[PDB]
Ligand SMILES: Cc1c(C)n(Cc2ccc(-c3ccccc3C(=O)O)cc2)c2ccc(C(=O)N[C@@H](C)c3ccc([N+](=O)[O-])cc3)cc12
């Protein structure tokens with residue numbers, strides 16, 4: 001193995017083709033090492049409006065919090081399809097029982113979305129609209145209850161996770177590992193899922209020992225970050241359908257997932 | 258390797274202090290459950306319970322069971338404190354952070370070790386002298402009937418990993434040194450110790466079990482299930498507090514639940 005490297009390469013390539021905005025580009029934009037385009041900054045309501053007028057977002061279908069929230073829903077639905085297409089390229093995935101494919105995606109897309117979301121975040125805000133914009137953290141937190149603490153856990157997590165300084169080639173395999181979780185509810189055949197995940201974990205371990213030679217504890221710290229991820233999801237659910245306080249039907253049908 | 262040797266030394270140290278801290282190990286529990294040790298008297302209904310009191314172990318069943326769990330929880334906290342102090346670096350931390358780490362760690366550790374006393378049919382009681390069935394515990398009047406069931410649910414899943422005491426020692430050490438506890442002052446020393454503990458556990462599982470990295474991942478993942486049952490427990494506790502007002506909660510446990 002000899003194969004963990006091949007698998008790493010394949011997953012990296014697939015990752016590049018599946019996700020338009022990589023962490024490398026995102027960091028280039030956030031630091032400003034290339035500029036080349038400073039992102040349109042949204043820090044309050046007027047800049048939000050002006051941004052809506054300039055960029056003309058595709059999800060604009062009339063209250064700030066609601067609009068931001070629905071933008072998040074739209075981007076999330078795009079992300080799900082990107083992640084699905086990436087999942088299909090994981091060696092062995094399409095050979096799994098179709099039910100299990102659907103289950104794995106259904107229960108993994110959240111964790112993966114937050115993982116990749118960390119790539120678009122620093123301690124001060126998040127890249128928005130394909131990287132064309134940047135929304136401040138303070139503006140997100142200043143939204144009315146309950147939307148005030150919607151984005152915050154993702155920011156906490158993103159800070160602590162970005163402290164690990166993973167690059168795209170690490171993240172590809174990390175995401176692959178997350179997808180192939182054998183403890184999703186309602187799985188019919190766990191064995192191949194965990195065999196594949198075993199191979200993926202080995203690939204990840206090697207990839208980390210090679211890409212990050214200075215640190216021997218990174219693997220354990222990452223695997224530990226997975227649980228952080230899952231509880232971020234757990235808490236997010238609790239905050240999520242507590243937003244059934246809201247109100248249409250066809251749109252809600254699009255986002256009923 | 259040298260680093261490997263360090264990790265092994267840490268593992269042996271932790272297992273040693275684990276054996277010295279906890280009088281009821283998983284090895285003894287399994288020796289009792291699977292017929293070296295005496296066989297337990299089994300309580301599975303009211304009659305066998307009343308006989309069980311004489312065989313031997315205000316008297317309302319659900320309440321008395323609740324209080325028993327409480328007593329054993331106080332003892333467990335004392336044992337866990339003693340163990341925590343044996344973890345290298347712990348006693349050198351800020352005192353407030355020691356208190357915080359214990360405060361948020363004891364529940365997760367207690368349920369972790371409780372799994373060792375459980376099978377899908379029930380749980381050892383009275384230092385392994387007894388065995389109370391899962392269904393008898395479910396049959397307790399509301400709301401005490403739902404007290405133990407989540408712990409059983411977790412216990413089955415967790416026991417499926419087939420860990421032994423030498424694994425558990427490092428795992429609970431990892432749990433204690435959690436850097437994401439609310440209200441910590443110095444996170445970095447804590448996470449520094451925990452990283453070492455995580456490496457020690459990874460190597461331990463590597464030497465003691467197959468597909469060790471996957472086992473490592475699953476085990477680490479169990480902490481989600483753990484925090485889940487802690488949450489459910491606290492909620493049930495709120496209910497009980499409201500409907501059973503003549504009931505004492507031990508001051509120590511109160512300190513633990515205060516502004517959790
Ligand atoms: C995929 C994704 C992105 C790109 N962002 C940042 C973002 C995206 C869009 C905008 C934005 C805002 C206003 C105007 C334009 C834009 C813009 O950038 O286009 C800002 C930041 C997210 C923020 C949160 C979540 C999330 O917590 N949960 C998902 C699974 C979910 C999300 C929602 C629900 N839900 O309750 O329906 C369930 C799960 C997901 C995402």
Ligand SMILES: Cc1c(C)n(Cc2ccc(-c3ccccc3C(=O)O)cc2)c2ccc(C(=O)N[C@@H](C)c3ccc([N+](=O)[O-])cc3)cc12
Pocket residue numbers: 314321322323324325326327328329330333364367371380381382383384389408490494506510
């Ligand atoms: C430490 C512990 C043990 C050994 N058992 C099994 C047991 C223990 C005692 C008995 C028993 C029953 C009757 C007579 C004698 C015994 C006996 O063996 O001694 C049977 C099984 C437990 C069961 C539940 C909990 C729990 O859910 N939460 C803790 C933090 C807690 C537990 C309780 C409370 N509380 O509010 O009371 C707060 C937190 C903890 C424990």
